[PDB]
Design a protein around this ligand. Structure first.
Ligand SMILES: COc1c(Cl)ccc(Cl)c1C(=O)O
Ligand SMILES: COc1c(Cl)ccc(Cl)c1C(=O)O
Ligand code: FES
Ligand code: FES
Ligand code: FES
Ligand SMILES: [Co+2]
Ligand SMILES: [Co+2]
Ligand SMILES: [Co+2]
Ligand SMILES: [Co+2]
Ligand SMILES: [Co+2]
Ligand SMILES: [Co+2]
Ligand SMILES: [Co+2]
Lengths: 341, 341, 341
């Protein structure tokens, strides 16, 4: 019910789209997503203007999406280009709503709000996903929880030990200086852990000069729910730029009030020509989502009714600064938008 | 919530009933339908007056339906004929509601509204279903959509050109000529496809024949939601009257606000003793009706919340006259009834 | 929505609890139930004070329940005993709600209401369950009906003549004699079946029986929804006291407004060292209690919307005295509680 509609959201990964329409709901809005013959992606409201049939169940006819019910045909902009009935007249009432869409950084971005306010330049920067110097692997996941629970999750390092123990684990609670930098529509949480233990994968690409001052775990948040992290390791006192690292794409898109779409990916600068490494990284990310984070957040969503019926508020700990700030920024965006409705 | 209760609806096909009660909900009213030992069908509110147990889960005892909970027995009129407890007294408070019911034309009709207005003069004529000159085959289907969506569907048979493409597509669709006749309590939509190649289905009716043909697809609607179509095909310019045809029964009965019962059938005057022709008609009913149409209308029902939340209204085409008129007649019946209670 | 929270309810059977937490909802309240290393049972609100994760999905760490999300640890009283984050401070806001709990008579009792009013001395007496002179076997069942429908069911044991026809029908039902004893927070219904043929079940307990049989079916109800019955059968003219019997535990605990937990058991004074009798009772509990009654009450729950929408009230028979009285006592408790906010 309460979404920030005036913002860019990822609706799909390029590989998911083709001439066969994909029906997907974004912010309670049903969409028909498909790639036209010229290769350009189109996004139409998945509701035919005639009698409301799902356009996503149709097929392309001469490059145009044909409604599966009575045959009306539409172009990528939503204009009805063919009416096979009667005099074949095509009044403006037959056009279907079209959404601004941009394919960039191996992501399909969509603006579900006021179309007059959609500026391609305000789209988050995920350039690493299409940089020849990086190898990117990823996927899609559906989760039955409000998207804000997963934003909280991604902005927090404290559950790694208990939720992702299979991968991330430690035994130190005396050393932890994470700085949170608040910008405009952007927030970064930087963490540098000297003497940090490199991953099993990034270790294979290290020669030898371990010295307490060489491990990073950072994350950047952009307007609403798009995040990119930075997991890295270095020899000694070398800068972040010259380290072995992976930039992780973690973008959430609300489906309904209690469900969301999760687009994940890893863009690494090591083992670039290792095909079996691709399967590995993609599976661990999938595991971290499906088999672990999903279980936790879906259980929390199931407790929302009780917490709201009663007046229960969360008790924050020292590790919640970044999440709390992002949570507050999203709230402000919800209010700023409602102050127009 | 909004149903036209003062009208006759089909609650079951004769073959579905026996001494074993059938529990079925009609217009949000749970019914217990069964055939008494004398062969007469009975319809009782499926709620025992004592503690509300489902009478439909009981069995007949000496021709009377016995409640499975504490044994009260009832006759076809809903009168409690036996109370096995205490002095065995049977006060009027123990009688269960009974609904007017009429078995006619191989259909079981029921009046769910004001029993004092049960006007049998209003039972639609489906005589072809029991005419020895016709062969009838049919079935039952349950659909998760408001019944009005299927009424719309059946009054626009032209959708077959797209929804039933593989069997009904016709190269002469663009030469279609339709008219609409409005009479006393009845609306008819006539369609004619002249001098074209028979569709895949029509070919089977003519036993794999080619050569130009004239087609007719007419449909009659009667008060609320009972329809009978006319599908005919014949060579060149032969008389519509002396043509090979099938009269299709298509009757809808609301179950809940968002679900309905669909009773379909085909009464043909050709291939009367041909088992393979029976198979062709049954294949068509299972594929087109039970599958194809269901997919479309159920997807539309899922889009109702969005269309209502926003102020979206349908855009009518030249082929919608008949459906729009029936839709308006049903609306008037809803208002005339609401102005009563 | 309307529950009598100020009363003791059974939340589990001792055998269901261990160091692995059991998540269960009682009166719309999610609980985490577990046995601490010292063997004492604990009951905490299954919602972590930090971010609301289910504590029931956690494990015990050094005798304390650890939240599976970020590691907070709690003691049986709900006090946070360990915070692994930052300075490890533990403000009062980190404690979780704990519920008064008492393990007695092989039952786990919990007080879901005002903790200040919980008095262990008001817990129903089910001593037979731990008396060395009796052999007790039982189990748990979940039912999708408001708990009051099952209380009604248990207070009218006469339904067994029809609902459990195959197992308990007696040909002397017509000569039954009832008595009802009313007390403070207690109501008893007595039934006597004089000189009849033993039912299939009673014959199983007796291991034969030629001569006529006297059967007793008594049941005691205590404040809210805890019942204990008395099933006895004897030959020719043996008195009820000095005889062979089983004391049946039948306790219901509301889960939601339309669902409940059913704890059943049989404590017999015959065949104490007989495995075959154990099977007979478990077979009965599985068939009659978990299958047969469930079908009836769940069907009734499905008819509640219709009966309420219309103004339908139940018509009582001569066998409803006990049930009606308990129903009235429960209503009074609901009102007395609603009158104090
Ligand atoms: C849906 O109406 C029909 C059409 Cl348009 C073509 C062929 C048949 Cl068999 C029917 C039928 O009555 O089922
Ligand atoms: C449901 O109460 C019973 C009746 Cl009515 C007959 C026999 C038995 Cl064993 C029980 C029981 O305690 O489950
Ligand atoms: S609903 Fe799309 S053309 Fe009719
Ligand atoms: S509920 Fe039908 S006789 Fe009791
Ligand atoms: S939700 Fe329990 S420790 Fe964070
Ligand atoms: Co074009
Ligand atoms: Co996580
Ligand atoms: Co009779
Ligand atoms: Co159709
Ligand atoms: Co301790
Ligand atoms: Co510590
Ligand atoms: Co029973």
């Amino acid at each position: 019910a309460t979404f920030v509609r005036n913002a860019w959201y990822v609706a799909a990964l390029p590989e998911e789209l083709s001439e066969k329409p994909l029906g997907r709901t974004i912010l309670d809005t049903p969409l028909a997503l498909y790639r036209q013959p010229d290769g350009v992606v189109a996004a139409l409201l998945d509701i035919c203007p005639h009698r409301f049939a799902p356009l996503s169940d149709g097929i392309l006819v001469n490059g145009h999406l044909q409604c599966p019910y009575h045959g009306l045909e539409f172009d990528g902009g939503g204009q009805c280009v063919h009416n096979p009935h009667g005099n074949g007249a095509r009044p403006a009432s037959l056009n279907v709503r079209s959404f601004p869409v941009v394919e960039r950084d191996a992501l399909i971005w969509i603006w579900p709000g006021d179309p007059a306010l959609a500026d391609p330049g305000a789209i988050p920067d995920f350039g690493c996903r299409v940089d020849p110097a990086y190898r990117t692997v990823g996927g899609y996941g559906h989760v039955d929880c409000n998207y804000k629970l997963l934003v909280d999750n991604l902005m927090d390092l404290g559950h790694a030990q208990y939720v992702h123990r299979a991968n991330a684990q430690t035994d130190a609670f005396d050393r932890l200086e994470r700085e949170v930098i608040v910008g405009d529509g952007e927030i970064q949480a930087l963490m540098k852990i000297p003497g940090g233990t490199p991953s099993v994968l990034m270790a294979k690409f290290l020669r030898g000069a371990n010295t307490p001052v060489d491990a990073w775990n950072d994350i950047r948040w952009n307007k609403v729910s798009a995040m990119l992290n930075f997991i890295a390791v270095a020899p000694e006192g070398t800068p972040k730029e010259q380290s072995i690292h992976s930039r992780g794409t973690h973008i959430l898109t609300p489906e309904t009030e209690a469900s969301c779409h999760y687009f994940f990916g890893s863009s690494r600068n090591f083992g670039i020509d290792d095909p079996e490494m691709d399967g590995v990284l993609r599976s661990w990310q999938a595991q971290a989502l499906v088999k672990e984070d999903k279980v936790v957040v879906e259980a929390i969503e199931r407790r929302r009714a009780y917490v709201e019926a009663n007046g229960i508020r969360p008790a924050m700990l020292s590790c919640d600064e970044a999440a709390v700030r992002v949570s507050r920024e999203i709230e402000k965006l919800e209010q700023l938008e409602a102050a127009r409705l």
